Symmetry: D2
Subunit: 115 residues, 4 copies
């Protein structure tokens, strides 16, 4: 599991459950191609997106469907989604956690890169 | 104006208006002594807390009454307040903006320090 | 001035100066069309991107070039950029401030929307 | 484990390791009395602070020694510490995670309250 996504809800103080998350890899023509996707779990986590053999160096985008999450809660949001765009780099053994903290008009994202 | 406080509301995307702010300074005897207080304006800003002359070196605490803010709006929030504690003016006088961004279960705070 | 961008640096506690910002608008055909661009001032602010007349309804993306910012300062940061994507003016004209707070492995963004 | 603390470092994109954390409970005379403390682990987590039988309703402060953490890294920080102050409330079965994201001149804190 070299890539995990974790999302929290700053309004309810809970995991953000059932949030859709799409991953893309940047193709040699500069377009984004689908690479992995899933819905966060009851713990706000999304595991099993990819494997070490598949997750090669490259630029990746992680799109988190914040707008659908807020609307399912009856809450008016600002952003269409949150996008996290980064280069994966093979400088020794590494696991990437992309964490996001959601508010209707604000979000933060942080990368926890370990091992 | 060496000390300014700005507060935003991440749920509405708006300045957080009428937020009470109390500032204290640590005394010779380790007590927190009341230093200045005020409330944010329509722009979410609080100016005029103190002066260049009064704002001497010290350890200061800026306590932002986030609970009263969220309660007056029908939200029962997590935190009692947001406390920002810092040493000021230890290399001479500086101008400090203390910004806070508020959600019911979360806050961030940043300091902008200029000469 | 219906669209303003403000960027702060959480490592230094300072405005983030000379940050390039590109804005795009989603076209009829789903493409991101270049809309306006500029760079933050000494105060970390970018004004004058557009006008009331030009800033029509639409889905807009504000791409903040955080990587070039951190690189020019000797830091190799995590993210390629910070992208803020939102629907604007769908209930009539509003004024939008898009604020971002930058660290090498993390960013937050907030929107202040006023009438 | 009704109370857990998790700290991340936004500059290195890692867990914040060996950060001292002190917990206090507000006494009937309004002073803060020591209640629990520890150092975050290699995963930036601090478990085993208290038990359900000990963790009664009351106001608690969690003080995270951010200033020592930054100084051990050779990095100049703003805040003396980060303090998170909240009321623990027995509305059914609940676990409190206090998460903090640290930058030298900024931090965010969020409460994840579950079960």
């Amino acid at each position: 599991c070299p890539l995990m996504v974790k999302v929290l809800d700053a309004v309810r103080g809970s995991p953000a459950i059932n949030v859709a998350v799409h991953v893309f890899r940047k193709a040699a023509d500069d377009t984004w191609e689908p690479f992995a996707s899933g819905k966060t779990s009851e713990s706000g986590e999304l595991h099993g997106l990819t494997t070490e053999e598949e997750f090669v160096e490259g630029i990746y985008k992680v799109e988190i469907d914040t707008k659908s999450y807020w609307k399912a809660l009856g809450i008016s949001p600002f952003h269409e989604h949150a996008e996290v765009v980064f280069t994966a780099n093979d400088s020794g053994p590494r696991r990437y956690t992309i964490a996001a903290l959601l508010s209707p008009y604000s979000y933060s994202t942080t990368a926890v890169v370990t091992n």
